[PDB]
Amino acid sequence: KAINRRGTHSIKWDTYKNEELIHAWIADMDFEVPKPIQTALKQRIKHPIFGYTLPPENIGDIICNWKQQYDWDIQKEWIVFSAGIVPALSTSIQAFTKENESVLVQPPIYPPFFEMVTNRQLCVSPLQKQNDTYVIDFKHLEKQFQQGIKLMLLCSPHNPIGRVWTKEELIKLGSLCTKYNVIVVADEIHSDIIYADHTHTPFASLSEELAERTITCMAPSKTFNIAGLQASIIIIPNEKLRHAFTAIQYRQGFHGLNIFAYTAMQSAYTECNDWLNKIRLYIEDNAKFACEYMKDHIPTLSVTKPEGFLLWIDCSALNLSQDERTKLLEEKGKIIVEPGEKYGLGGEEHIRINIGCPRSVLEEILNRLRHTFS
């Protein structure tokens, strides 16, 4: 069921008012949230007082149990609260680097990684496009660490290309972080949408030593489409780094999350297991359906196959500018996507689309892509 999202103050569906537009840019799904979550949220409103709230007594076990998803054994003492992964990227920047020290990213990558480093020096190690996918340039990556890299921002799974890194990839990158003592911030916000042939490998799960150097940021906000509820869990095994993170959160006046962030994250992590099994097969089939429609009906585009709900498509054979592509997609396509040039080196002449939609919606998303470039 396509659900009307116009008139809901949703950034995706309400920022543009021309009702002819199809929106597939912002990375939230157009699906009903799991009912267990909604039942807890309407249950909580039955108490008409919204004063200051504590984190629940049980919240530590629930998250430690959610080993159920990745067989990582954590302790309750590691969990830190954040209103979103973006503040935790900034706090991890300001905690573990000095001003004018460098921070490394692997484009094409989520732009906030670029903007938050507004605070530090840009170092890049763009990934290499191989075999209809992306791979890390480990020789070049270590060529950057030989210059003094202090922090690395890892995306796993990697937006926008959709890479779910293997254990061997992380180890050999882990082998370089140990060897050069690079601190790692692991933005694993998509850790819960993984396809049938892949398995998410938490970076700190690999080792006792990589655990003491990695800050792992997770949330149900993207997985369960509750990104307006602002729940995030940051796991820091190293006690000495955890306190410097929490100092950078305390002197900014952050004192924990709001009533609905606590309530939703508790239900999402306890009672929503079967809905997440469903959404994985619907999303994976939406990626499969889309990758063939580009074979049959748009042979001038190259789509990088994801392994974990965003689709990364090469539009380089078209020889179009971003201004040429954007205007065309809006005028005849009547569809709003993300321009890829803002993803950095390797995002040029690409677009990113949201496949977290009903297949009915996905067909018009592709029908208008064909019309645009036919």
Ligand X SMILES: C=CC[S@](=O)C[C@H](N)C(=O)O
**283 is an interface residue for its own copies by CB under 8 A:** no
CB of 60 to its own copies, least distance (A): 13
Name the residue nearer to its own copies (CB basis): 257 or 294.
Answer: 257
The three-point CA angle 122-125-127 to 5° equals: 140
**254 is an interface residue for its own copies by CB under 8 A:** yes
Q: Take residue 285 and report the two structure tokens written for it.
A: 């089939």
CB of 357 to ligand X, least distance (A): 14
**29 is an interface residue for its own copies by CB under 8 A:** yes
**224 is an interface residue for ligand X by CB under 6 A:** no
Binding residues among 171-230 for its own copies as defined by CB under 8 A: 225-230
**159 is an interface residue for ligand X by CB under 6 A:** yes
Name the residue nearer to ligand X (CB basis): 25 or 373.
Answer: 25
**25 is an interface residue for ligand X by CB under 6 A:** yes
Measured distance CA(66)–CA(215) in Å, rounded = 18
For residues 242, 245, 246, 250, the Cα torsion angle rounded to the nearest 10 degrees is 170
**55 is an interface residue for its own copies by CB under 8 A:** yes
Breaks (C-N over 2.5 A) in the chain follow: 66, 117, 119, 308
**26 is an interface residue for ligand X by CB under 6 A:** yes
The three-point CA angle 85-361-327 to 5° equals: 80
Among residues 87, 84, 69, 77, the alpha carbon closest in space to that of 202 is found at: 69
| CA max distance for the chain | 59
For residues 115, 315, 163, 193, the Cα torsion angle rounded to the nearest 10 degrees is 90
**25 is in the binding site of which of ligand X, its own copies, none (Cβ under 5 to 8 A by kind)?**
ligand X
> Residue 138 burial (CB < 10 Å; 0-12/13-18/19+)?
middle
Which listed range, 2-10, 183-191, 345-353, 360-368, lies at the site for its own copies (CB under 8 A)?
2-10
* Site residues, ligand X (CB under 6 A): 25-27, 110, 159
Positions that interact with its own copies (CB under 8 A): 3, 5, 8-12, 14-15, 26, 28-33, 35, 37-38, 41-42, 45, 47-57, 83-91, 94, 112, 115-116, 118-119, 225-230, 247, 250-255, 258-262, 264
